[PDB]
Amino acid sequence: SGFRKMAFPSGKVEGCMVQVTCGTTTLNGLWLDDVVYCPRHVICTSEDMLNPNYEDLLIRKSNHNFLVQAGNVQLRVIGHSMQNCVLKLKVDTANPKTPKYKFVRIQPGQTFSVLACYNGSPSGVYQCAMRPNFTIKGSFLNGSCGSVGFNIDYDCVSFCYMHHMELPTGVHAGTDLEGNFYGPFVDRQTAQAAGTDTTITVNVLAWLYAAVINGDRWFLNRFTTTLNDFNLVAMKYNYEPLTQDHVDILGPLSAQTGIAVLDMCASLKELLQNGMNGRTILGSALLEDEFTPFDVVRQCS
Amino acid sequence: SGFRKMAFPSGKVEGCMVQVTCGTTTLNGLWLDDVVYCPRHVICTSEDMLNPNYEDLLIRKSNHNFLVQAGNVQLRVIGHSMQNCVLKLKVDTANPKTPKYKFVRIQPGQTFSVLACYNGSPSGVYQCAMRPNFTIKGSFLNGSCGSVGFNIDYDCVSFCYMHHMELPTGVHAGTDLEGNFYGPFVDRQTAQAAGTDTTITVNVLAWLYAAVINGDRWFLNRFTTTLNDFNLVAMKYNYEPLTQDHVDILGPLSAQTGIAVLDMCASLKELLQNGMNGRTILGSALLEDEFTPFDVVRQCSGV
Numbered sequence: 001s002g003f004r005k006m007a008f009p010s011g012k013v014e015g016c017m018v019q020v021t022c023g024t025t026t027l028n029g030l031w032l033d034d035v036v037y038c039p040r041h042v043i044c045t046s047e048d049m050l051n052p053n054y055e056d057l058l059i060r061k062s063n064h065n066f067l068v069q070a071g072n073v074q075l076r077v078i079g080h081s082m083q084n085c086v087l088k089l090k091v092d093t094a095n096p097k098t099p100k101y102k103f104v105r106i107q108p109g110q111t112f113s114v115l116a117c118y119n120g121s122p123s124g125v126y127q128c129a130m131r132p133n134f135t136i137k138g139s140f141l142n143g144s145c146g147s148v149g150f151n152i153d154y155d156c157v158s159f160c161y162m163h164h165m166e167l168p169t170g171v172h173a174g175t176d177l178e179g180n181f182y183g184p185f186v187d188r189q190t191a192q193a194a195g196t197d198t199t200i201t202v203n204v205l206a207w208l209y210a211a212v213i214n215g216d217r218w219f220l221n222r223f224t225t226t227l228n229d230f231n232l233v234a235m236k237y238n239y240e241p242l243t244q245d246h247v248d249i250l251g252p253l254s255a256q257t258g259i260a261v262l263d264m265c266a267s268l269k270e271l272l273q274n275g276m277n278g279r280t281i282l283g284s285a286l287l288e289d290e291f292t293p294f295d296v297v298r299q300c301s
Numbered sequence: 302s303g304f305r306k307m308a309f310p311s312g313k314v315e316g317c318m319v320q321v322t323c324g325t326t327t328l329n330g331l332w333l334d335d336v337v338y339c340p341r342h343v344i345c346t347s348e349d350m351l352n353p354n355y356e357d358l359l360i361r362k363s364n365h366n367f368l369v370q371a372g373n374v375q376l377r378v379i380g381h382s383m384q385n386c387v388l389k390l391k392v393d394t395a396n397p398k399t400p401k402y403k404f405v406r407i408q409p410g411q412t413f414s415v416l417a418c419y420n421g422s423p424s425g426v427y428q429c430a431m432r433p434n435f436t437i438k439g440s441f442l443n444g445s446c447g448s449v450g451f452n453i454d455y456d457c458v459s460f461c462y463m464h465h466m467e468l469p470t471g472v473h474a475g476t477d478l479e480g481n482f483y484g485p486f487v488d489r490q491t492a493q494a495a496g497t498d499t500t501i502t503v504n505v506l507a508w509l510y511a512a513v514i515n516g517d518r519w520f521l522n523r524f525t526t527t528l529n530d531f532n533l534v535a536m537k538y539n540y541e542p543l544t545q546d547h548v549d550i551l552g553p554l555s556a557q558t559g560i561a562v563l564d565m566c567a568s569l570k571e572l573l574q575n576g577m578n579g580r581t582i583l584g585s586a587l588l589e590d591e592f593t594p595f596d597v598v599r600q601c602s603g604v
């Protein structure tokens with residue numbers, strides 16, 4: 001029993017974190033086999049921030065300009081290449097702690113663990129969801145760039161996020177490990193703002209199923225809804241559309257609890273109308289949308 | 302920017318988790334140096350659980366009765382002993398992944414990271430506070446006994462919690478690594494309930510400071526109070542008394558903010574009657590009390 005934002009054990013990723021320095025700029029890199037991945041803005045300077053030409057900046061660098069440190073060991077850079085917004089530094093030694101891993105690009109609504117790091121040294125681990133507006137709501141200070149997000153279903157680490165920047169509203173933007181940004185963001189200091197965010201409806205429903213699994217039914221009701229009528233109401237609260245895909249994905253949790261998906265949708269409609277009237281659900285006084293259906297199944301059974 | 306509940310990186314502890322099997326019972330052990338620590342109820346059968354005689358159950362057992370698995374490697378037990386509610390299994394090999402560590406006993410209101418494990422394999426990590434009623438609000442299923450809680454200071458792991466049981470209300474109870482229970486609980490399958498919980502006042506204030514540091518300021522006001530007046534309202538709402546040591550600990554945040562504790566208690570005083578009813582601080586509709594002042598400083602400074 002209990003239900004918590006539960007991160008993956010971070011050890012497999014801790015052994016991959018290194019420090020990358022160019023001039024006065026130091027951030028984190030990810031050391032997998034004989035490659036170190038880091039944000040390409042490690043090669044910018046102060047006057048480079050608004051409109052850096054990364055191709056022109058990189059061509060002027062020699063390998064010895066990159067100082068890569070793994071704990072106390074200095075890693076020798078023997079080559080480099082830029083892929084989208086990620087720099088790939090070939091180093092002269094393969095990381096002996098490299099886990100089984102893959103790179104995946106996730107969709108909005110998916111969750112992952114963030115290993116926040118400074119100077120190549122991990123400081124904390126926590127869960128994040130990719131918001132519908134392609135930001136994440138993390139906790140990052142200066143020097144955290146190059147921290148990564150990952151899942152570890154099975155014993156394979158799936159890297160899905162590398163942290164690049166904090167936007168004006170305090171939320172965070174980054175890339176996949178192929179260097180493609182999530183969302184419309186670019187790695188330069190020009191004015192950028194996240195779009196209006198919305199609530200991840202399928203995740204709220206998954207969390208309500210988690211509440212039922214854990215023994216709480218107070219928010220259910222005797223009503224059902226059509227998928228169309230549910231979406232018409234939920235969008236008035238800035239909720240994301242619920243698709244037939246989402247309804248299919250919730251099938252297993254519906255089966256375990258005996259509550260049809262569209263019956264849980266009717267519960268959510270009433271919760272948006274009424275609020276919680278002094279009650280909580282799984283310890284929260286708001287509707288939680290950063291647990292996926294997969295997360296609920298991972299944690300509840 | 303941002304403020305999140307963050308656990309310590311768990312790698313130093315992952316390398317210490319093993320599986321301990323006694324008959325049909327399998328749970329998790331902590332392998333440090335050449336000893337494996339686990340809950341003593343691993344030696345009970347279902348019928349023993351109702352009213353166990355642990356020193357008699359332990360007398361009946363021998364080294365060969367304990368099956369200890371580290372990954373795919375079997376560890377040989379060469380000795381066994383009990384310390385309070387923890388079993389100590391001497392093995393023939395020192396864990397080469399043993400971190401610098403010590404055993405500590407934490408105080409209510411203090412936080413730690415939990416590494417939830419099943420069959421000796423780490424499964425998830427999250428932060429917990431030791432509640433005033435000596436429970437923790439974790440997330441644990443059958444097979445999680447022997448999972449541990451810990452803090453990290455530089456390179457030294459301070460182990461503070463070993464998981465033993467889930468109470469009827471769904472909250473969790475355990476021991477320190479010397480086998481002493483937190484709270485008025487016993488390791489027997491019997492009706493037990495934690496006392497009425499209370500809210501950790503100094504942590505709520507710490508979290509209000511975190512909210513200010515992050516631009517959330519609508520709860521600030523011009524007023525101030527004193528301990529006696531606040532503690533009087535704290536009592537009414539089931540909040541822990543606020544001591545002078547608490548005010549001292551929040552000193553740094555009062556400075557770096559311009560809000561005096563009793564000024565903030567006046568803020569908190571106000572929130573306790575009028576309240577939330579929907580509105581939010583740091584994205585929460587309720588007053589969060591599982592962040593310590595150091596959690597706030599540690600996180601809002603990059604340590």
Ligand SMILES: CCCOc1cc(Cl)cc(-c2cc(-c3c[nH]c(=O)[nH]c3=O)cn(-c3cccnc3)c2=O)c1
Pocket residue numbers: 024025026027041140141142143144145164165166167168186187188189190191192302
């Ligand atoms: C849209 C407006 C923001 O524009 C950009 C654009 C770009 Cl390309 C980078 C950055 C940025 C750089 C650094 C950084 C610089 N120099 C270093 O030595 N180490 C660093 O880490 C850090 N953080 C940051 C701060 C707090 C939390 N998370 C990330 C950043 O956002 C911001």
